[PDB]
Amino acid sequence: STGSATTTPIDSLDDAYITPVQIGTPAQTLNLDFDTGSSDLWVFSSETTASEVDGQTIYTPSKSTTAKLLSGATWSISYGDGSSSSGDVYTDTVSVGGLTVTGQAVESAKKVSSSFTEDSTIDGLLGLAFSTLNTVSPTQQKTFFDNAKASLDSPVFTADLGYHAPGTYNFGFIDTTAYTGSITYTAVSTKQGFWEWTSTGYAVGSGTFKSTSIDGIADTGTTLLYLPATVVSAYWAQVSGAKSSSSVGGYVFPCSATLPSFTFGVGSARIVIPGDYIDFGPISTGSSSCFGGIQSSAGIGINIFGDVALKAAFVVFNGATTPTLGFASK
Ligand SMILES: NCc1ccc(C(F)(F)F)cc1
Numbered sequence: 001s002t003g004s005a006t007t008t009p010i011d012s013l014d015d016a017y018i019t020p021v022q023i024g025t026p027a028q029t030l031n032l033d034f035d036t037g038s039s040d041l042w043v044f045s046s047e048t049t050a051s052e053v054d055g056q057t058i059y060t061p062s063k064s065t066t067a068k069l070l071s072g073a074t075w076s077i078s079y080g081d082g083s084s085s086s087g088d089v090y091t092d093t094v095s096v097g098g099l100t101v102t103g104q105a106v107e108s109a110k111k112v113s114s115s116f117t118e119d120s121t122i123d124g125l126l127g128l129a130f131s132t133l134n135t136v137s138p139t140q141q142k143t144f145f146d147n148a149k150a151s152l153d154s155p156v157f158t159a160d161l162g163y164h165a166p167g168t169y170n171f172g173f174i175d176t177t178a179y180t181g182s183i184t185y186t187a188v189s190t191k192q193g194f195w196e197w198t199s200t201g202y203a204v205g206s207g208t209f210k211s212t213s214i215d216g217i218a219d220t221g222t223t224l225l226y227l228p229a230t231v232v233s234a235y236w237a238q239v240s241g242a243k244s245s246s247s248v249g250g251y252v253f254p255c256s257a258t259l260p261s262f263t264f265g266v267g268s269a270r271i272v273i274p275g276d277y278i279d280f281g282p283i284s285t286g287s288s289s290c291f292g293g294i295q296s297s298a299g300i301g302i303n304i305f306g307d308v309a310l311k312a313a314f315v316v317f318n319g320a321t322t323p324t325l326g327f328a329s330k
């Protein structure tokens with residue numbers, strides 16, 4: 001079996017992407033943020049503190065004939081940006097783009113942090129990292145992908161994110177019309193629970209490619225590209241007037257500047273990020289300072305190939321017994 005669903009940017013800056021997901025019987029459709037950097041499926045629900053809900057669509061387990069409370073199970077998650085949420089756990093039927101999993105753990109939020117409440121377009125997250133990171137206690141739960149793996153035609157899903165445009169998540173097959181050239185596959189380490197891989201280097205604009213190993217994670221749930229300080233400094237040095245701002249929390253640049261492209265290595269292949277993808281617009285309404293899409297990972301502890309990088313490519317998440325990541329130009 002296979003599934004295919006359209007994913008849509010939530011705003012004009014591509015800050016995140018939402019994908020419709022059917023939960024329960026009869027279906028309740030929620031727009032979830034597909035996150036290859038986490039492993040919990042959690043949703044706003046009828047159990048969420050009413051003051052913490054502001055326009056989200058909520059899951060109501062009492063209206064689903066297939067929902068079952070997972071007795072005594074709880075969950076609690078904190079994300080790398082300081083976001084958090086927690087609650088209890090149901091099992092229910094979950095379908096993505098025609099692909100149905102029964103008995104999927106659906107984590108119902110009782111408390112959510114402010115950053116989720118203010119994001120009225122995101123009804124929850126669907127985690128697609130490895131199940132070892134799932135926070136359900138005392139019995140850890142599997143991700144949607146792990147539960148679907150057996151019935152998929154191939155144990156893969158692909159992310160085809162659009163630049164200021166809709167894109168596609170596919171489960172169980174590789175659309176050979178969605179990319180150009182060949183797919184370059186590279187090894188994945190699962191030791192930390194992430195889709196972790198090693199990039200073979202980088203180039204700024206039309207400069208010389210610098211061969212150097214950059215270990216990082218493929219994370220559809222993170223907007224920007226976070227790379228070591230040496231790399232990020234070399235990129236922004238090519239932008240007239242760009243500087244690191246402590247009050248803003250990263251590199252900013254004059255909105256009138258033209259940004260160079262950024263190339264990253266996948267084995268012997270090269271993925272080119274157009275400079276326009278790195279512009280995240282004015283730091284405040286009316287400002288002439290703009291926020292950069294490539295920032296330093298020094299404060300984070302891990303390098304993150306977020307949406308800025310992934311949307312420049314067709315990306316295969318191969319969940320075979322030896323997992324791999326594939327990248328193709330598009
Ligand atoms: N998108 C989920 C996520 C968030 C934060 C991190 C960090 F910061 F810990 F690396 C990894 C994955």
Ligand SMILES: NCc1ccc(C(F)(F)F)cc1
Pocket residue numbers: 016033035037038079080081083115116119122221222
């Ligand atoms: N990386 C996971 C993640 C995704 C989205 C959000 C936001 F933007 F909704 F707060 C926080 C954390």
